[PDB]
């Protein structure tokens with residue numbers, strides 16, 4: 383359903399110590415989970431693996447999919463950030479999320495695989511910290527994502 387919401391996939395990568403991977407936006411001081419659009423003809427899961435390698439340098443063999451979200455979670459952009467006169471105009475995102483366990487070493491994370499790298503650093507953070515730190519208009523989504531994944535993450539410790 384074309385609703386003004388652009389289809390998107392997000393990635394929560396965890397370890398065995400209750401932590402998730404938190405990535406620093408390239409040349410910036412702001413942080414986020416990896417995320418990116420789902421292309422026409424693509425499944426959310428295929429899009430997830432693609433952006434996992436493009437943004438984090440990890441492949442299918444480096445992770446286990448522990449959980450995912452069946453349904454969209456939507457946020458609307460802030461009115462001022464709405465890019466008017468663009469095609470297609472986008473009033474927010476509708477997102478599926480995947481919870482991945484990192485089963486390779488931390489050294490396999492490589493954020494330089496693309497020619498326009500999305501991030502320039504990363505660090506482990508406790509799994510609920512992103513909920514408090516994500517830009518305001520994403521917070522309801524992140525609350526729902528982490529509440530769905532919290533039990534699984536903790537069952538590894």
Ligand SMILES: Nc1nc2c(ncn2[C@@H]2O[C@H](COP(=O)(O)CP(=O)(O)OP(=O)(O)O)[C@@H](O)[C@H]2O)c(=O)[nH]1
Pocket residue numbers: 412413418419463475516517
């Ligand atoms: N001041 C801040 N602005 C933010 C933050 N996160 C996102 N944004 C702003 O909102 C815009 C949309 O960010 P989104 O993450 O929803 C999708 P984005 O367009 O950034 O990804 P690309 O496909 O790589 O262009 C983005 O271009 C920034 O201007 C943040 O932590 N702080």
